[PDB]
Amino acid sequence: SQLYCSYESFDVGSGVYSVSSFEVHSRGQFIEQPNSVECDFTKLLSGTPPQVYNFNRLVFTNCNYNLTKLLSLFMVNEFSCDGISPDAIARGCYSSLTVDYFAYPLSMKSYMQPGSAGVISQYNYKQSFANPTCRIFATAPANLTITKPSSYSFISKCSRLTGDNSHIETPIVINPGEYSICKNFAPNGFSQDGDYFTRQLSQLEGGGILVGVGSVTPMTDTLQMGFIISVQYGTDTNSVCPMMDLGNSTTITDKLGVCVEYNLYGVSGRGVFINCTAVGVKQQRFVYDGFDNLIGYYSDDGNYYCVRPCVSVPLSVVYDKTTNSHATIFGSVACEHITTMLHGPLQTAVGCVIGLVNSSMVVDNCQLPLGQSLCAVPSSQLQLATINYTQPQLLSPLNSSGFVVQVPTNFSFGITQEYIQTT
Amino acid sequence: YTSSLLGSIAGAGWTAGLSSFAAIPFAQSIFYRMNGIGITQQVLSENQKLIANKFNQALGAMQTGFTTTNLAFSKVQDAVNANAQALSKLASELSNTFGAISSSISDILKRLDPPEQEAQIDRLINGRLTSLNAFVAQQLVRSETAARSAQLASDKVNECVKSQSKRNGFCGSGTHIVSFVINAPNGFYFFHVGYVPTNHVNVTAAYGLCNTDTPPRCIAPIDGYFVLNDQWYYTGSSFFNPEPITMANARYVSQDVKFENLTNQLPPPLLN
Amino acid sequence: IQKVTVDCKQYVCNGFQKCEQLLREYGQFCAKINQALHGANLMQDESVANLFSDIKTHKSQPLNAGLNGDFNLTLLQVPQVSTSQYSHRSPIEDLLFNKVTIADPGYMQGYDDCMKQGPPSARDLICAQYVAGYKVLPPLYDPNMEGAYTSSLLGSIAGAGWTAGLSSFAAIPFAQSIFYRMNGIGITQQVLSENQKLIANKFNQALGAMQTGFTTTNLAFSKVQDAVNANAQALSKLASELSNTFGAISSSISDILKRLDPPEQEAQIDRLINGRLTSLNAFVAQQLVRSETAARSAQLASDKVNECVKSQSKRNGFCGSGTHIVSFVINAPNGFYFFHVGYVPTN
Amino acid sequence: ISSSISDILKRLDPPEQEAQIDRLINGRLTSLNAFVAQQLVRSETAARS
Amino acid sequence: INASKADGIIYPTGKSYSNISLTLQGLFPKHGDLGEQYIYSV
Ligand SMILES: *[C@@H]1O[C@H](CO[C@@H]2O[C@@H](C)[C@@H](O)[C@@H](O)[C@@H]2O)[C@@H](O[C@@H]2O[C@H](CO)[C@@H](O)[C@H](O)[C@H]2NC(C)=O)[C@H](O)[C@H]1NC(C)=O
Numbered sequence A: 001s002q003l004y005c006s007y008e009s010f011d012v013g014s015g016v017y018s019v020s021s022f023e024v025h026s027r028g029q030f031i032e033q034p035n036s037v038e039c040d041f042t043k044l045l046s047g048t049p050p051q052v053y054n055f056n057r058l059v060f061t062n063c064n065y066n067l068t069k070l071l072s073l074f075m076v077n078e079f080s081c082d083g084i085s086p087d088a089i090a091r092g093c094y095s096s097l098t099v100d101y102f103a104y105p106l107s108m109k110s111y112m113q114p115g116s117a118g119v120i121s122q123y124n125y126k127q128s129f130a131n132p133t134c135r136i137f138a139t140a141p142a143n144l145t146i147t148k149p150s151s152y153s154f155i156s157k158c159s160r161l162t163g164d165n166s167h168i169e170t171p172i173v174i175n176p177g178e179y180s181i182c183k184n185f186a187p188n189g190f191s192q193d194g195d196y197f198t199r200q201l202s203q204l205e206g207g208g209i210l211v212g213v214g215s216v217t218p219m220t221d222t223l224q225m226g227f228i229i230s231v232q233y234g235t236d237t238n239s240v241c242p243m244m245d246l247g248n249s250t251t252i253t254d255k256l257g258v259c260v261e262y263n264l265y266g267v268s269g270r271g272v273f274i275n276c277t278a279v280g281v282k283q284q285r286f287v288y289d290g291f292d293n294l295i296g297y298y299s300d301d302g303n304y305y306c307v308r309p310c311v312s313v314p315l316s317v318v319y320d321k322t323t324n325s326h327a328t329i330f331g332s333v334a335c336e337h338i339t340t341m342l343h344g345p346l347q348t349a350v351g352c353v354i355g356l357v358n359s360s361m362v363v364d365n366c367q368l369p370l371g372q373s374l375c376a377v378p379s380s381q382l383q384l385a386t387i388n389y390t391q392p393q394l395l396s397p398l399n400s401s402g403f404v405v406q407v408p409t410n411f412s413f414g415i416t417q418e419y420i421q422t423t
Numbered sequence B: 001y002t003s004s005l006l007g008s009i010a011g012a013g014w015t016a017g018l019s020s021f022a023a024i025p026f027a028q029s030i031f032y033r034m035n036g037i038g039i040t041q042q043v044l045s046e047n048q049k050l051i052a053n054k055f056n057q058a059l060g061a062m063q064t065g066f067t068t069t070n071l072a073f074s075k076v077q078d079a080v081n082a083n084a085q086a087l088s089k090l091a092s093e094l095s096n097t098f099g100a101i102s103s104s105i106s107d108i109l110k111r112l113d114p115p116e117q118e119a120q121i122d123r124l125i126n127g128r129l130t131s132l133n134a135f136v137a138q139q140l141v142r143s144e145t146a147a148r149s150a151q152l153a154s155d156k157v158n159e160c161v162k163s164q165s166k167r168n169g170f171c172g173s174g175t176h177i178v179s180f181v182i183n184a185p186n187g188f189y190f191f192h193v194g195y196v197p198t199n200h201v202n203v204t205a206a207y208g209l210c211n212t213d214t215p216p217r218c219i220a221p222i223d224g225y226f227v228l229n230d231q232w233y234y235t236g237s238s239f240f241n242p243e244p245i246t247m248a249n250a251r252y253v254s255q256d257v258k259f260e261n262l263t264n265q266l267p268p269p270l271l272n
Numbered sequence C: 001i002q003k004v005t006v007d008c009k010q011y012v013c014n015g016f017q018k019c020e021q022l023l024r025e026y027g028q029f030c031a032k033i034n035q036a037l038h039g040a041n042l043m044q045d046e047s048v049a050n051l052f053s054d055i056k057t058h059k060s061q062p063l064n065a066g067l068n069g070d071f072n073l074t075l076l077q078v079p080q081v082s083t084s085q086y087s088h089r090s091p092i093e094d095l096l097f098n099k100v101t102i103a104d105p106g107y108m109q110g111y112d113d114c115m116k117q118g119p120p121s122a123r124d125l126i127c128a129q130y131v132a133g134y135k136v137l138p139p140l141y142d143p144n145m146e147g148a149y150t151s152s153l154l155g156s157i158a159g160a161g162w163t164a165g166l167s168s169f170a171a172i173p174f175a176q177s178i179f180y181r182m183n184g185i186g187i188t189q190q191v192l193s194e195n196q197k198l199i200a201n202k203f204n205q206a207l208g209a210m211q212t213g214f215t216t217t218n219l220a221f222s223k224v225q226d227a228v229n230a231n232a233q234a235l236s237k238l239a240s241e242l243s244n245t246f247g248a249i250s251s252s253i254s255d256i257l258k259r260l261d262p263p264e265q266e267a268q269i270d271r272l273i274n275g276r277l278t279s280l281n282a283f284v285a286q287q288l289v290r291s292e293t294a295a296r297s298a299q300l301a302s303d304k305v306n307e308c309v310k311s312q313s314k315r316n317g318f319c320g321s322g323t324h325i326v327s328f329v330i331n332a333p334n335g336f337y338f339f340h341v342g343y344v345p346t347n
Numbered sequence D: 001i002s003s004s005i006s007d008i009l010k011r012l013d014p015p016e017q018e019a020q021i022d023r024l025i026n027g028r029l030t031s032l033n034a035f036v037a038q039q040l041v042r043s044e045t046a047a048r049s
Numbered sequence E: 001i002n003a004s005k006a007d008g009i010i011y012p013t014g015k016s017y018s019n020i021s022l023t024l025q026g027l028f029p030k031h032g033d034l035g036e037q038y039i040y041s042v
């Protein structure tokens, strides 16, 4: 029936066709998760947030965190993510999580968009897009431990004065995810608007006069914060996982050789696990190929498991339109796999076949060749027959002086037809 | 062009070029062709009507050979299907969305407004331009294949239709006698008529005959076999008919140790 | 060529339900790929079957176990009792097959072996067929049947050298057949009688030299390696293009489904679908070119058998360099390997 | 927006400039693949001619 | 730095490879770099 659908017709010519292998099923789970520490957010939750140009950075590596508590405390006004989504952050593991948090008014959120020509991008913060990142603007809890700053301040100018004496001016712009050297003028925030700060740069710093101007905006009724969040994958042996209820750790010992889903220290997927001689460096928990695929694993059991991809048995259908019967060729798989692990069969050189009957026939011409000198001959079941090799006639040499020949006595005219394409 | 190849005249057969033109009737050309494959004129003169009856049976049989089981007739359909599949690919690629919201430009204009509709239209443009480039590359390869197959078509007509090839396998199996070509869809259709032996007789042969004289004069057959039927006889390669050894079928050769030393009932070439 | 077919649903989507839902729009294009590859493999089966119909020997003669008269043909002869698996494989054919690295597809137990194989092996490209989705198909004839057709050519009897056509079968022994072929090039029977054993020594030393002529510097053996590599590089392109991101965040549908949500994840999968469907079209397009090229070359193989193996050629350059005396043929990976024997004067 | 990377780098900022450049990378690699396949057939045709 | 003895080579952070030759982007020293020599009195 799948052959009819593939050809989209009830009338299909007799032949041997390749159909889709049936869907493979997972047969268990292989979970190995440690009881890792809780990610320390006590700096973000207990303290006064800094300014945009003096942002704090948190990197979490080998810990679990409760994202529900963090999201309950804050009230997100707008988030813009590229490369990843917040739900994916909420339901998956990653090698690292970097959170750059700072105080930021919601009115200026337009000045943090990619491509802005304003002063925030040049002198205060520029988001890096080398990793899957999201930018989040929210509101802090009203009466919790987060204390509002005096005001919101940002750097409006950061230039270098190097000319005949000072006339030539050159602005100093920050690379993505980096601080401005004008931050050290007022590292705890600018006191008033238009504060003018001047420092003499040393020779090792290039020389000149560094000029910085700060801009201050009044504090709002509720504290408004901005977060720049980035994650990494495949760069660590341990993962940062939100406290999702994955379940208890399981042992692959009882399910070796079957295809199961796995969650191994934050790395997820499906595949087959086989006992293997230890290769690679044990300290690095995973062994990869050139194409960045997981091919080996080291377990708490102490063994090294080869992670073969989850596969399915190839299928082929033999169809004979006139007799209206079919057989199934399971290629390259012995009948023991089909007979005992299916979720009568006959073993042939092309695989295991259900439908044919071994009558031990030999046929000179058969139009359904299975391969390896095997073909199906219709009979009401198709029968497995072998293509015949007609033995050449043998003419023994003559023992006398001369030689023996076979000359024709009767003949016919045989018309051989040939077609040559020309256009 | 093709129907004129049937009555064409190119030479006497034993001639060695295309310069001459001999108006030998079609009947007498076949018998000379059959005499070139190893049948003596005595068999032809005796089985004159037998050959024609066999030939007419072969010509009537090719009427029923136009079936999918035949290899040559299948190649005709494969060429028509190759042409048809070329047009099918062009039609199918306009049902391709290439990732757009639709495969129809009308749907994109109906469903979307600029600047988003330009991006969706440009998605179809790049896909269809890429599809045509793949179509052009395939057509060029097919055109060269047909061009080089047309060269073989000119080769086949010159060697099989306008002459009698001595090459085994080429111009059909068996032994080539005459080939007829007719117009076919997107090419030509040939009919390689061959001499197919049906029954055999095992007969003792001799590599050659020599006489016990000084120096020993020895002969070898021209295009047949020395054959026993104590006397030796000449037979054709393609048909059995013992005939006397004479200058018409005996060719002088140098002395060899594998030839028969004859002392009685010598052939006329070895006499005197 | 190696017969390859793909599962378009599996190759594009890798068993993911979300991807297959999107692939329903491109359902027509998946079906055509399966039909173009299937149609291009029936041509291979018809080509192989028609080839061995032309190579077929109607009548043959017995040959001695090795020394035929004074000529030695042990390298070209199938043994009476064979320790090896292949019943109709010649010793020189063993050396050719022992000098070429071919990965065993495992036509009947390959799927089980790939599951058993923990450490990577040379069949990694073969075992990738159950992962990516393509399927290497078995050839029409097994090696034993192929060897039977070529072995029957050594003892093939046709009409005599002077005879017209192929309507008669003369039982001339191998030695006397070689001497006739040398007599047709300008060597008198007086010379052949006097230098009879010298010719046999010359012929035997030529046959023994090709036992060590299978080197990468040789042109003929270089071609047999390129044929195997061309088959291997066709499977490598199938597997490697499954790691092409096509502008998406990842080349694996799992990672897209783990980092993105609709409508963005469906767009990313659409990039892989379009890229993989176009890659399959290129793979199909070049497979047709290769199959037709091998089909036309399969025609040339039968032409050389009927002009070099079954008969002495009066051509120049055809059937090898020099003046043609005899030519033998053995089965080689994806084709034939002829040994054209010529007459090369030295003084 | 343009066939030249120079115009893409002058007119856009990340992450948009990477997506536009990725359009050219995929297009030119696919074009290079077509050039290889076309050249292979021409090479084989001239090798048998 | 010889780099044929794998001098100053940082391993991948969280992956391992077995019996393969790979190309990697990373912070690596230059071949033949003499560097800067420092001597301590000990
Ligand atoms: C699973 O892991 C290893 C198997 O390693 C084997 O190493 C070779 C000997 C070869 O047989 C490979 O195919 C395998 O990958 C086993 O660990 C050792 O097992 C032996 C015998 O049981 C024991 O003497 C050692 O002390 C074990 N060493 C360690 C470090 O555990 C292990 O027993 C296997 N478990 C099975 C097969 O159930």
Ligand SMILES: *[C@@H]1O[C@H](CO)[C@@H](O[C@@H]2O[C@H](CO)[C@@H](O)[C@H](O)[C@H]2NC(C)=O)[C@H](O)[C@H]1NC(C)=O
Residues within 6 Å of the ligand: C066, C067, C072, C073, C074, C075, C091, C208
């Ligand atoms: C005919 O050729 C074969 C093949 O070269 C010769 O057999 C070889 O004999 C010696 C020792 O047995 C070695 O060169 C090889 O081991 C043999 N090769 C085989 C068995 O394939 C054989 O000796 C030759 N015959 C004569 C009479 O010299």
Ligand SMILES: *[C@@H]1O[C@H](CO)[C@@H](O[C@@H]2O[C@H](CO)[C@@H](O)[C@H](O)[C@H]2NC(C)=O)[C@H](O)[C@H]1NC(C)=O
Residues within 6 Å of the ligand: E002, E004, E005
């Ligand atoms: C870089 O390393 C290679 C290999 O480690 C060095 O080559 C070795 O040189 C010594 C001589 O001091 C020989 O004894 C070894 O046999 C060589 N090993 C080889 C060739 O594999 C090479 O000299 C080093 N380059 C330097 C030191 O500049």
Ligand SMILES: *[C@@H]1O[C@H](CO)[C@@H](O)[C@H](O)[C@H]1NC(C)=O
Residues within 6 Å of the ligand: A066, A068, A069, A243
């Ligand atoms: C996470 O926090 C919520 C609310 O504070 C709580 O209900 C839940 O039990 C916490 N989960 C863990 C694992 O502590």
Ligand SMILES: *[C@@H]1O[C@H](CO)[C@@H](O)[C@H](O)[C@H]1NC(C)=O
Residues within 6 Å of the ligand: A347, A348, A358, A359, A360, A384
């Ligand atoms: C069919 O049965 C016969 C009976 O002995 C057996 O020899 C043969 O191997 C069987 N065929 C196959 C394909 O197993």
Ligand SMILES: *[C@@H]1O[C@H](CO)[C@@H](O)[C@H](O)[C@H]1NC(C)=O
Residues within 6 Å of the ligand: A401, B257, B258, B259, B260, B261
């Ligand atoms: C014929 O005679 C010659 C010379 O006596 C001899 O060498 C040869 O073997 C003889 N052949 C036959 C067939 O008698």
Ligand SMILES: *[C@@H]1O[C@H](CO)[C@@H](O)[C@H](O)[C@H]1NC(C)=O
Residues within 6 Å of the ligand: C119, C120, E019
């Ligand atoms: C390592 O790879 C080579 C191929 O370069 C292979 O021959 C060898 O068997 C492999 N060794 C192991 C232990 O896998």
